Structure 1
Amino acid sequence: GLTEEQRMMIRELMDAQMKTFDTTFSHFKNFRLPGVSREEAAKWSQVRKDLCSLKVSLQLRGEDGSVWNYKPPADSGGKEIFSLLPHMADMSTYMFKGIISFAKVISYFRDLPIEDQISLLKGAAFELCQLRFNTVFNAETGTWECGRLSYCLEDTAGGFQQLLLEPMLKFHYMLKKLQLHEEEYVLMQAISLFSPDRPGVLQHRVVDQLQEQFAITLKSYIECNRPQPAHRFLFLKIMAMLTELRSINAQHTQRALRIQDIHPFATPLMQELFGITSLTERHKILHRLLQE
């Protein structure tokens, strides 16, 4: 029911996704692991709240059948709250490098000015990373199952209703319940990627047109591949969750910048995305990875 041009758009996105998403995290190697003034105090107080929302226990399953489990320390008002940030910095960097590869395979993204390619990836990196994380999220166990690595949310003593208070965790449970297809996920990634109102975009109109065509393909896909009455508003549900994911990005990018101030964790590539220190000059790593 889709046009051939729409069918090819989905084929190119699914192809890019297959080539750049390591669903088993098999190539995520060599990562760090946790080891065995008044205004400045205000900055620390805000960071303590930020780190507490998304606390997870880490699990590593070995080839031999062993299981190494790490349980996060409870907040004792010290640098113990930053125990997993170095590992999460290596994971986010591994994910963003694959998100950069995803965009490069897409022909419509390659034909853009590289300044616009950097700005689109700078504004969408968190969003396409959470979208990929959602596909490995088990809502029954609250665990991101990333190959041998597993990340299980801790109970926080409140309940699933205390977890849903956190917009990020609510995004993951709600998106997982829509039970989207692989094609609908990759279309969400494209719609997020080709956001015309990202900071620094100059081809605003050209990018907006691309986004509209991706959304129409997703809208038409939902019409032609799902029972029409029951999934009548599924497209609008996806788009509203994409708008919420844009909001969550702004919150957590600023949470990450607060934590970076008091306690640096960012990798050189994540630093460029965060703006920590011309668009090409400020993003030399991202520029080189795109230029390849």
Structure 2
Amino acid sequence: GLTEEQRMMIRELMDAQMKTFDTTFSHFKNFRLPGVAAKWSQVRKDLCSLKVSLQLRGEDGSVWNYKPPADSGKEIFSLLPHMADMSTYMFKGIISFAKVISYFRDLPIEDQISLLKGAAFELCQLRFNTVFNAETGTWECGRLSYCLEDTAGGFQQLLLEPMLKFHYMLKKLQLHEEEYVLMQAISLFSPDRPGVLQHRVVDQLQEQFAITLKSYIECNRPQPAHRFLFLKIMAMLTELRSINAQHTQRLLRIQDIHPFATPLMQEVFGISLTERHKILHRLLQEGS
């Protein structure tokens, strides 16, 4: 059903995903852990929305479990250094993912920086959804797991958070690996990211990935449960871009109050294009 170029396009994306996604997080080490005016009132309401407990299962069978403090002053920033290290590690895998794709490495190094800069959060969330357990509200990251804390309204209150609603909605679609990796490609090759110069070239690339996704779905999903699935996916990607803008502003408000971002994260935000992104520029020039 798929064309030969579309089959090869899916094969390269799937191969890149396998080579660059550490699903067991076995190489995630040396991370930080919680030790053994209205800007504050605005910041406090953001962190509590996505409260998680941290669990670490050792290779021997032991389990360390961290329950966060129940308050809202600097105790709300206890897990941010760890989540920053976790986010940075996921982003380095995202950078490697883009470097393996032939359509990406042929772009100018400044556009490669701009595309990764604008899609860092989005591709991280797409990979996070593949390890999200919707029944337990837990992201299962190999030895580490992040379990959402219960609340009064239960499922109702937590779903008001658009980031959590995105993960539950996307998980309900029961996407295949091929559909996830095509979403990552469509988000990565966004022609309207700030700083992009080859707008038309990136725009032509994005359209071919979307056409391939539509063709893949029509060849492998006949059930009425998957009606309009391609348009649902494209709608989810538009929603994810909106969530990216809102959560980037949350982080900068928190970085204002309590600095926590890693040097690579600081490059992604605001905290010569190659001069302001020395780490990303180096990682893009290195091999894999």
Give me the TM-score of the superposition, normalised by structure 1. 0.96
Q: Secondary structure at the match of 2:104?
A: helix
Displacement of 1:45 after TM fit? 1.4
1:56 to 52, 68, 73: 52
Displacement of 1:63 after TM fit? 1.9
1:241 to 225, 231, 236: 236
Displacement of 1:75 after TM fit? 1.9
Displacement of 1:229 after TM fit? 4.7
Instruction: Show the counterpart of 1:26.
Output: 26
Displacement of 1:230 after TM fit? 4.2
Give the distance between the partners of 1:194 and 1:228, measured in 2 at CA.
Answer: 30
Give the distance between the partners of 1:134 and 1:183, measured in 2 at CA.
Answer: 14
Aligned-residue Cα RMSD (Å) equals 0.9
Q: Secondary structure at the match of 2:202?
A: helix
Give the distance between the partners of 2:74 and 2:225, measured in 1 at CA.
Answer: 50
Q: Secondary structure at the match of 2:275?
A: helix
Instruction: Show the counterpart of 1:154.
Output: 149
Displacement of 1:64 after TM fit? 2.1
Give the distance between the partners of 1:195 and 1:228, measured in 2 at CA.
Answer: 30
Instruction: Show the counterpart of 1:261.
Output: 256
Structure 1 residues 227-236 or 9-18, which shifts more?
Answer: 227-236
Displacement of 1:232 after TM fit? 2.8
Q: Secondary structure at the match of 2:243?
A: helix
Structure 1 residues 153-162 or 233-242, which shifts more?
Answer: 153-162
1:166-188 deviation line (CA, Å, top 9, x unaligned): 00000000100100000000000
Give the distance between the partners of 2:85 and 2:225, measured in 1 at CA.
Answer: 41
Long gaps (5+) in structure 2: none
1:107-130 deviation line (CA, Å, top 9, x unaligned): 000011111110100000000000
Displacement of 1:144 after TM fit? 0.2
Displacement of 1:243 after TM fit? 0.4
Give the distance between the partners of 1:154 and 1:67, measured in 2 at CA.
Answer: 18
Cα 1:228–1:71, aligned 2, differ >3 Å: closer, same or farther? Answer: closer
Give the distance between the partners of 2:173 and 2:148, measured in 1 at CA.
Answer: 21
Give the distance between the partners of 2:154 and 2:22, measured in 1 at CA.
Answer: 32
How many residues of Structure 1 are paired with residues of Structure 2 in the alignment?
Answer: 286
Give the distance between the partners of 1:55 and 1:23, measured in 2 at CA.
Answer: 23
Instruction: Show the counterpart of 2:167.
Output: 172
1:133-161 deviation line (CA, Å, top 9, x unaligned): 00000000000000010000001222111
1:286 aligns with 2:243: no
Displacement of 1:191 after TM fit? 0.2
Give the distance between the partners of 1:106 and 1:291, measured in 2 at CA.
Answer: 14
Give the distance between the partners of 1:229 and 1:163, measured in 2 at CA.
Answer: 29
Displacement of 1:43 after TM fit? 1.4
Instruction: Show the counterpart of 2:67.
Output: 71
1:7-48 deviation line (CA, Å, top 9, x unaligned): 000001001000000011111111110011xxxx12111111
Structure 1 residues 240-249 or 154-163, which shifts more?
Answer: 154-163
Q: Secondary structure at the match of 1:73?
A: coil
Instruction: Show the counterpart of 1:163.
Output: 158
Give the distance between the partners of 2:284 and 2:206, measured in 1 at CA.
Answer: 21
Q: Secondary structure at the match of 1:144?
A: strand
Q: Secondary structure at the match of 1:70?
A: strand
Displacement of 1:69 after TM fit? 0.6
Displacement of 1:228 after TM fit? 6.0
Give the distance between the partners of 2:218 and 2:129, measured in 1 at CA.
Answer: 23
Structure 1 residues 64-73 or 185-194, which shifts more?
Answer: 64-73
Q: Secondary structure at the match of 1:26?
A: coil
Displacement of 1:132 after TM fit? 0.2
Q: Secondary structure at the match of 2:160?
A: coil
Identity %: 99
Structure 1 residues 163-172 or 58-67, which shifts more?
Answer: 58-67
